[PDB]
Amino acid sequence: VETFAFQAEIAQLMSLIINTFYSNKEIFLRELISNSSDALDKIRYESLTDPSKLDSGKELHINLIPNKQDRTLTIVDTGIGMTKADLINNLGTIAKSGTKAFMEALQAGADISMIGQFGVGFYSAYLVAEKVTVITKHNDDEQYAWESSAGGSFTVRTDTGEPMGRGTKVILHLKEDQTEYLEERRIKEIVKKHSQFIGYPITLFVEK
Numbered sequence: 563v564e565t566f567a568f569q570a571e572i573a574q575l576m577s578l579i580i581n582t583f584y585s586n587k588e589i590f591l592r593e594l595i596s597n598s599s600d601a602l603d604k605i606r607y608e609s610l611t612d613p614s615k616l617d618s619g620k621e622l623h624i625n626l627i628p629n630k631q632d633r634t635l636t637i638v639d640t641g642i643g644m645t646k647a648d649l650i651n652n653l654g655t656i657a658k659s660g661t662k663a664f665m666e667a668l669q670a671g672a673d674i675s676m677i678g679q680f681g682v683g684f685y686s687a688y689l690v691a692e693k694v695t696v697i698t699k700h701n702d703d704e705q706y707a708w709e710s711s712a713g714g715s716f717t718v719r720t721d722t723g724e725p726m727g728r729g730t731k732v733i734l735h736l737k738e739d740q741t742e743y744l745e746e747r748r749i750k751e752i753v754k755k756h757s758q759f760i761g762y763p764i765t766l767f768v769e770k
């Protein structure tokens with residue numbers, strides 16, 4: 563397991579998200595579904611010029627999986643996935659500029675719900691999760707697990723869990739007071755409100 567420091571700007575963003583009083587936490591789900599949709603758009607487009615990129619799975623979809631025993635909400639997609647370089651280096655570089663712009667916008671009167679306009683909507687996960695685990699598999703790279711409970715660091719390891727084929731699984735370990743996001747009625751409500759027109763099937767699993 564390798565441990566990395568977030569760039570200072572991203573650590574600062576995460577602290578703001580965790581510390582700021584902001585009741586409209588539900589927007590985290592829209593932001594993660596948006597990311598899934600973007601990743602799905604990417605594999606779809608790439609597959610038009612190289613159909614073999616779908617050898618790792620033809621189905622393009624999003625599953626939402628609540629688990630009350632584990633207190634997790636998992637968002638699974640079959641998008642393009644992220645490479646080790648994406649996880650450690652590339653996406654952080656991009657997130658640095660988006661974060662700066664978002665911070666400045668907040669000072670100017672924007673609110674946390676606008677985070678996705680700055681390309682860093684993922685971090686809104688920390689409105690509801692104490693720990694986020696991201697399992698991801700891109701063609702031509704290995705399956706990795708990224709993980710962070712904030713506090714300025716994240717880890718990456720090669721994942722020896724169940725093989726995903728291709729795509730990304732975001733496992734939200736929910737804060738004790740945010741279990742409403744495990745309720746079918748609540749998730750359905752949020753998806754209808756904010757993600758009604760996403761161009762891939764979203765299946766909300768129910769609990770046993």
Ligand SMILES: COc1ccc(-c2c(-c3cc(Cl)c(O)cc3O)noc2NC(=O)C(C)(C)C)cc1
Binds near residue numbers: 599732
């Ligand atoms: C907004 O920035 C991103 C959105 C989605 C993804 C993504 C994701 C992804 C990321 C997150 Cl955080 C998520 O919640 C869902 C995803 O499918 N999986 O593969 C992905 N692959 C990439 O898009 C490229 C172009 C970099 C290879 C990465 C960055």
